[PDB]
Unconditional design. Structure first.
Lengths: 38, 324, 605
């Protein structure tokens, strides 16, 4: 019965986990060589 | 006459059979170490320069340097610009950077009678000095190089004499007034002297270095806004002509200062565009006197816009109205 | 099967990493500062850690840590300074050490004889694992290759150092070795000819090698994926880099200064911004005239907000799943827009001041062909008002370069202005501008312009901008900048002489169209021989013996963002039949040029 909605609230749940990661993957100071010398 | 002819023929023979190898078993990489073994210095270098390989060129140059008499080294290397260029540059880099083989440049530039390049070396020395007394001694040497020719080097020599003079007067200013002066340019000196109120000395600077009037005015105007001396700014306005106009006096005083003192330069402003006198009174915050000017030029549209700004009642407004 | 800028990046990274493998175990890294930047274009510091790097150190910092045992050096090998610098550090760490340390040196791009001699005359040569890192072109974009030799302009035109020409030749030769001989080597200018001559000398040595059993299998034939290479010498057109650039990226370089696709700003000490073609917004903004940036900036803000609202319609998994899909791409675009709104804002303030407009006013008159004496009062004002020395000197050099010298009476005054204005040290500064032949008296043989009426004479006659202003339509006042119809948009009415020369090769029909009126061939300088003759240096077209091919436009001695944008403007017009790829020794501008000449010593305490 409701054993088809349970996947949807897990699908659309992890969907937002990735988008939250990517928007964090563009987080602050980008990796460079000079940044690692200071 | 003969003793040298044997050389002119022999070496012209060593070259004959040497060129009989740039054909078989070339190129560049292997052929300049070969030529350099056979005491064909001048050919090795030229071959290296043609190759474009900077590192190769160095190798023949470095070899020539310790092999040949230095006088002859300079001779050989100065025939070829690209070689002289690199010898010249390296004499500025043997550390690297900073440290200088000045002795090499001095000797090199003298042999080629390169006086500008030689004099320039001494100017570089004058900058490194801690005392202006020893700094002036370096400039003297620079000047002494240029005193021979004389023609063409007229400006440089004048410039040098100008610089020696400027340092001497600057050294004086420190003794008397207890402040930094040595090192500053002529223009920077007139500025600091005026900002500090020493109006008299500044004029002695202007006179000695033949400072262009239009420049002197621009320096004075800027240096007085610094001192905020609106009184002697006021005193300058009391004459007819200005070599820089009065619009500079307008805009420069208006910026960070009195809208009051600024507006008094209209209508001394000869070079102005029509109906700009109005907007100037506006920027000075004098809406009252602005409307009055709008009328004199018979531009009632400006009279309309200025009254609409106020509003027939506020800021009197009638006073704006009564002027029409 | 054609040329791809990505294969350059890949080779560069792979060549670097294969040398890091060679030193087994973990290692501490030491890099030449003005080499770290360019390296960041081919490799991540992330990737470097994976290959065993603990701490990073600039060579010019003199603080290499004794942490790890292996010490790896990466510096350009042609540099006299770098050789001494490393040797000095190998003694600072051999007489302050606690362990023996393994010392590795990766010379870019090669181990030089000089390098060894400096290392030898320090004893530390024996304790040195010396390898070669054949880095040449750093691919800054898919269509931009640069050697990233920052001091190449000073080196070449002031010091008369053939190193940049040598490297660039080798770099270009690398392209030939992979993709075949350039069918045509077309060029203009002295150093363009030197590059071409080295390309022919190196070719013969490859044929002398393969013939004499050095093998290498083969054996080079004309390319099938390359139309030609066009080489322009920077000393042919000093004017274009002297002018204040008016494109968005140009003005950014003019005010913020762009290095290695990056820059510094204060309000997003200060922070570092990345500036390259990845960011979809910057792509459209960079090559555009700064005027229409507002029009463009808003339009993108106008489209983003009504692209976030949209598509909550079909509230069925997908059309939201698809919305959340395009969600990180919105946020990025949103933060990009906020940055380039701030940046655009700062630049708008720079361009509104008096001094800027006074400068640009002078620039416009000189360019257009007004009598430079009319601009004398303006220049004098600018010196008197203590406007920055680089900008004043650029007006002076622009004056000299575009009018074939300065009148001898006006010249003596300008010199007085500079000396008294900024300090007598600049007796040297003016001497250097004289050596660069960018600031000469009209009574100097070197200052004369190429004329086909003024008899013969003159070995290094200068570019005649007076003749070329009309004959190559250097002025276009028509140009609309919302939808630019011609490269002259980059300077709001003035097309760079350099890129007009390229158009004499590539877009011949169009050029005649904007002059008098009304593939396969005809290639070369054909039909424009007399016009190009009035530009400095040798004109040449060496020949070495289907569908759209690539064309390399090479700048020896620096290129400007304006010239890059202009070239991109043409690349689009030619997108069908040609792929235009830009190469250069460095990326240059007016301030970098002046810095080559300006003496910084000071007569002070």
């Amino acid at each position: 019965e409701i054993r088809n909605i349970e996947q949807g609230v897990s699908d659309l749940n992890v969907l937002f986990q990735q988008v939250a990661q990517l928007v964090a993957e563009q987080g602050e100071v980008l990796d460079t060589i000079e940044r690692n010398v200071e | 006459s003969f003793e040298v002819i044997a050389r002119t023929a022999y070496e012209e023979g060593r070259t004959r059979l040497a060129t009989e190898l740039l054909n078989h078993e070339p190129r560049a990489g292997r052929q300049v170490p070969l030529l350099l073994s056979m005491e064909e210095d001048e050919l090795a270098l030229d071959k290296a320069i043609e190759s474009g390989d900077t590192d190769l060129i160095y190798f023949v140059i470095h070899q020539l340097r310790r092999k040949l008499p230095l006088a002859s080294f300079f001779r050989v290397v100065s025939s070829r610009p690209t070689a002289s260029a690199m010898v010249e540059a390296l004499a500025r880099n043997s550390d690297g950077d900073g440290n200088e083989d000045t002795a090499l440049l001095k000797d090199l530039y003298y042999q080629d009678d390169r006086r500008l390049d030689g004099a320039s070396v001494f100017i570089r020395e004058a900058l490194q000095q801690p005392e202006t007394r020893t700094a002036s001694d370096k400039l003297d040497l620079a000047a002494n190089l240029l005193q021979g020719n004389q023609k063409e080097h007229v400006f440089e020599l004048g410039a040098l004499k100008e610089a020696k003079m400027l340092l001497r007067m600057q050294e004086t200013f420190e003794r008397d007034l207890t402040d930094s002066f040595v090192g500053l340019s002529v223009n920077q000196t007139m500025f600091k002297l005026i900002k500090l109120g020493y109006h008299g000395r500044a004029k002695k600077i202007q006179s000695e270095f033949k400072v262009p009037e239009r420049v002197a005015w621009w320096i004075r105007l800027q240096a007085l806004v610094a001192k905020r001396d609106w009184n002697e700014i006021e005193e300058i306005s009391r004459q007819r002509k200005s070599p820089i106009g009065w619009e500079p006096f307008f805009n420069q005083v208006l910026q960070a200062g009195n809208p009051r003192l600024a507006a008094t330069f209209i209508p001394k402003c000869t070079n102005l565009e029509p109906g700009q006198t109005i907007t100037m009174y506006e920027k000075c915050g004098m809406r009252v006197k602005a409307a009055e000017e709008a009328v004199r030029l018979k531009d009632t549209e400006a009279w309309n816009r200025l009254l609409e700004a106020a509003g027939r009642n506020t800021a009197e407004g009638r006073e704006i109205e009564r002027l029409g | 099967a054609g040329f791809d800028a990505e294969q350059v990046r890949d080779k560069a990274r792979k060549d670097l990493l294969h040398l890091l493998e060679g030193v087994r175990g973990k290692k501490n890294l030491v890099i030449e500062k003005d080499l770290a930047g360019p390296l960041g274009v081919i490799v991540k510091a992330s990737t470097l850690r994976d290959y065993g790097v603990d701490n990073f150190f600039f060579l010019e910092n003199k603080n290499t840590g004794t942490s790890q045992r292996n010490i790896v050096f990466i510096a350009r090998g042609e540099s006299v300074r770098n050789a001494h610098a490393i040797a000095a550090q190998i003694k600072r760490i051999q007489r302050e050490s606690q362990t023996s340390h393994d010392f590795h040196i990766f010379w870019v791009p090669r181990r030089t004889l000089f390098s060894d001699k400096v290392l030898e005359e320090a004893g530390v040569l024996g304790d040195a694992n010396i390898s070669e890192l054949p880095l040449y072109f750093f691919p800054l974009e898919r269509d931009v290759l640069s050697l990233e030799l920052n001091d190449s302009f000073r080196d070449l035109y002031l010091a008369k150092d053939p190193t940049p020409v040598f490297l660039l030749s080798r770099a270009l030769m690398g392209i030939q070795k992979k993709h075949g001989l350039f069918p045509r080597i077309i060029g203009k200018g002295e150093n363009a000819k030197r590059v071409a001559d080295l390309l022919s000398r190196m070719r013969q040595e490859l044929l002398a090698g393969e013939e004499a059993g050095e093998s290498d299998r083969a054996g080079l034939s004309p390319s099938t994926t390359i139309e030609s290479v066009i080489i322009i010498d920077r000393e042919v057109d000093f004017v274009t880099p002297l002018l204040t650039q008016l494109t968005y990226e140009g003005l950014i370089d003019e005010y913020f200064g762009i290095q290695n696709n990056q820059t510094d700003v204060d309000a997003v000490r200060k922070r570092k911004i990345q500036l390259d073609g990845s960011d979809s917004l910057y792509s459209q903004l960079r090559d555009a005239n700064f005027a229409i940036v507002g029009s463009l900036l808003n339009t993108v803000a106008r489209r983003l907000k009504s692209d976030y609202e949209s598509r909550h319609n079909t509230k069925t998994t997908a059309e939201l799943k698809e919305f959340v899909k395009k969600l990180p791409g919105y946020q990025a675009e949103q933060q990009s827009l906020k940055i380039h709104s701030n940046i655009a804002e700062e630049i708008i303030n720079y361009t509104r001041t008096e001094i800027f407009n006074k400068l640009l006013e002078v620039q416009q008159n000189l360019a257009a062909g007004a009598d430079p004496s009319s601009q004398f009062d303006s220049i004098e004002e600018l010196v008197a008002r203590d406007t920055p020395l680089p900008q004043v000197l650029r007006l002076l050099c622009l004056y000299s370069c575009i009018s074939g010298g300065i009148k001898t009476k006006e010249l003596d005054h300008f010199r007085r202005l500079v000396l008294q204005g900024y300090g007598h040290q600049h007796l040297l500064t003016l001497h250097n501008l004289e050596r660069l032949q960018m600031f000469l008296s009209k009574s100097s043989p070197l200052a004369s312009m190429i004329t086909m009426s003024g008899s013969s004479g003159g070995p290094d006659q200068k570019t005649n901008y007076t003749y070329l202003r009309k004959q190559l339509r250097l002025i276009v006042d028509e140009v609309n900048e919302q939808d630019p119809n011609d490269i002259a948009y980059v300077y709001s009415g003035y097309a760079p002489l350099s890129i007009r020369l390229v158009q004499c090769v590539l877009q011949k029909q169009y050029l005649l169209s904007i002059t008098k009126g009304s593939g396969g061939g005809a290639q070369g300088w054909k039909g424009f021989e007399e016009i190009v003759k009035h530009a400095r240096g040798p004109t040449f077209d060496e020949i070495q013996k289907g569908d759209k091919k690539t064309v390399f436009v090479v700048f020896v001695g620096g290129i400007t963002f304006t010239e890059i944008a202009a070239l991109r403007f043409i690349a689009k017009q030619e997108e069908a039949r040609r792929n235009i790829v830009i190469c250069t020794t460095s990326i240059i501008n007016g301030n970098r040029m002046m810095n080559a000449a300006i003496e910084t010593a000071t007569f002070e305490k």
